[PDB]
């Protein structure tokens, strides 16, 4: 992979060395030492286990067992059991009662309607438990080490052959807050949504301790009533109104081996490694200057930030510089460098750069001088 | 308590030399220097002082005072003045109206009944500040050192003897989400529950603040009215639902001293301490080959790991090896840091994440390991 | 500006040299070599840009064109197309119909009255999102360099001169919680209020993405229907209650010259910073022992806190010790409160215990001391 720098690692005189590394997914750290096998890490998966159901919202329902009882002026109010029982969808109103629909005084008559409601069609909401976020860091010799890691359990150990023992001590950062953020499962498809966004919809909608079904008007009406009889309807599906309102939301991928496992997008995890004393060899990188290619242009990851591929064909193993400013000057960088240690391992090798560019219009600048690439990018 | 090892700590050619702990309670580090006396440093407590109270959700409920206004037909709507008070919970209908109950014409007659709530019991509901959780880290020389950290105030100086100045730098992780959780008092109990969940409850309710009761509807009914009359009925007392709600729910303790402190069992502080610079030594730990029990047996933890407890028969100083299994490769993860034996026929504790579904965990190696079935839903 | 200790660096046999420092805002640190120039770090400021908005809540507002439909006994219910428009307040119910009014027998009519619903001014909300906050770090050589951070984006590297490439791991801590807060925009003011308040709040709101007014009642008023007209009364302005509540809340500033930018004052940015392999100067600071003043009064941050200045007149550089009695029972959310130079303040914040303490700043005849009341 990606060999660490002299500032990256450091060796006391006594006790052990302390090297610090930021991991990011699609990348990995390598470590050398004299008469030693080179030790390659990297950030394999970040991940969330059976995330709690929090809430089901309704986008299609359906009503059955229509139920009416009326009643003529001076008879009382009318009732149904099913007014009492749960599934149903009740309206209470009063209609116009005379001497035409056999009533002998004319005058308002109570009357109510009972449906039984079932929800066809639902879409899922899953609540992110940030210190149960996973994430496997893998280390393996020029023997493999699969290390599994949890936000509560940071703190790792393992052995290595050569190196000895060793301990990691690991943070998460996410590049969504899921304070703010749901898991939103429909059918196939998975999404993450603002909070507050879901919460606002005006569908049906159950808790996770399934109790019963919510605020059921929205997808039903009672239609004015006649003598002794009403009309209740289910509303159309709402499906096509949520998934165009889905369009601006970003996916979420369930893994491949378990597919019950959400994997984040992106995010990276910063370890410091604890070694027993070594001395290690670190490398130094140049800033490239030439010859800078688009793989992949600049693309929108859909939590804020644009992703872009880059190949570099001439010369050198070099940190490439990324600036994004509203001028072409290039005088002010007015934006974030998510990604660390941009770096080009070989001549010919593309690599992954992801910005966090001003709201606005920007101007992302990669390279210098003559060489230098740059991208019009739109944020809002 | 448990001795630092060679990698745990760094000194420099110049400056200081750093120490790198993670100390969760229960638990204790101790740091050892040539000529120089042992310094222990552990995790006392870790606490939450005076969370602030969101809403009190009522179970109990109760009317007195009940009011009735009526009306004729051609008269009007019926009005309370008890209508534009607060503290009521009021109903509005009509009855049928006819000779029989004093009115000329027969049609419906407005009618509008109020009755004063109050409520006998009450559930409340606290959010906890993350940035102002407290954790009091205690170092003692071979003098006592009391520290007294918040997650803000991470950066803490002391000064020790023979060790002189020293700056811890710290990090607190908690075992639960606060973002997702509330701590719920019920009486003299005390729970941690989701948002969501206290938030669903089809109970009345009220706000931090104070303000009025809501959605008083729950715990009331309004009979068919009468002539003349409604019968305003306040449901039953609704503890039994909601602690059986609550029996899936990890109890919170208070404090055995300030009885202001919520005590969090679980969740791990980590900590960096900057010494000045002197020369340290660092133990070595082998993994534990022979000889374990089992004296407490692997139980939930309430936050969605297991917790046992193991005594060691023969292995001396030792490492304790701890898998969680579907030929064993662990598809679990370790939430204990240094599972550490000092000395033989003394427990340790071990706290452990297995993956949903059904899982063996394996505690050691060769013949003389353990093992044990777990199920996870 | 303050240099930093011995042990907040370490210098390794190989590889690089390592110096860990907490950086506060209104704060500098420096760091200093032999035969190399000074480097200043200091943490400029922490800020939000654009944080999407949650919610409209509405303290004042607007009726107009009410319009009604009647109808007699046995005639049917009343409608108005109005009803289904989402921009109406409508209201359902009976009027006495007679001989009076029209209707040929005595009965309940059916009545609808329909007010369109507008908010003349209205409160934002705006949730933080936490990984998405950013400090900026600023480095100058005794050529000045300007550092973006993002929650996100913890690590940085910079290149100055003598002293090389330099790797900047930081984290960054906050003095108020956003997972339980908004911050609420009146007019030309913004301030964090408490989630839970804000939702409870008995006001019409609206949704972040727009749509429509919900809970309209809240702010509008229907008289008792008379033969054949209902009256519609908009409530007064409701900014008064809203601000009267906001009092006991702390204020944010909006900076200014961009200002959809919001600057979060306080929370501290914990940093390691990574050089190649030097020789670094450490200070030591002795104990302040005498002669402290305070200019300024210990206040209330808002965020429960309290803050204060203090000024020695004889200590030179020193470290000032500061405690919160009934051994102290609280904690200091300052980081190295020390006193650079003499005759200039130094900023001490201290989180006191619930209930009346005593503030200890110093020792000896010279300490100072402070009654403080935290309810």
Known sequence: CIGITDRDFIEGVHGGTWVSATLEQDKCVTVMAPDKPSLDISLETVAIDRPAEVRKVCYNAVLTHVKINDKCPSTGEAHLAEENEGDNAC?????????????????????????????????????????????????????????????????????????????????????????????????????????????????????????????????????????????????????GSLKTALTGAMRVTKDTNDNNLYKLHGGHVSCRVKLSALTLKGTSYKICTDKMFFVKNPTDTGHGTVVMQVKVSKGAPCRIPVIVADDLTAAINKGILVTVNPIASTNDDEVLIEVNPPFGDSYIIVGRGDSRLTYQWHKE
Not at 114 to 139: G, N, P
Not at 175 to 197: C, H, K, L, P
Request: proline share 2%.
């Open 91 to 239: 309206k209470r109103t009063y209609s116009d009662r005379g001497w035409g629909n056999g009533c002998g005084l004319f005058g308002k008559g109570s009357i109510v309607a009972c449906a039984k409601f079932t929800c066809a069609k639902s879409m899922s909401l899953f609540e992110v438990d940030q210190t149960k976020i996973q994430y496997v860091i893998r280390a393996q010799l020029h023997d493999i080490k699969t290390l599994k890691f949890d936000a509560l359990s940071g703190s790792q150990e393992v052995e290595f052959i050569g190196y000895g023992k060793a301990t990691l001590e690991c943070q998460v950062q996410t590049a969504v807050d899921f304070g703010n953020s749901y898991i939103a499962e429909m059918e196939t498809e998975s999404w993450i949504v603002d909070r507050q966004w879901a919460q606002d919809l005006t569908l049906p909608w159950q808790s996770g301790s399934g109790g019963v079904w919510r605020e059921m008007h929205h997808l039903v009406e009672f239609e004015p009533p006649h003598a002794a009889t009403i009309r209740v309807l289910a509303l159309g599906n709402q499906e």
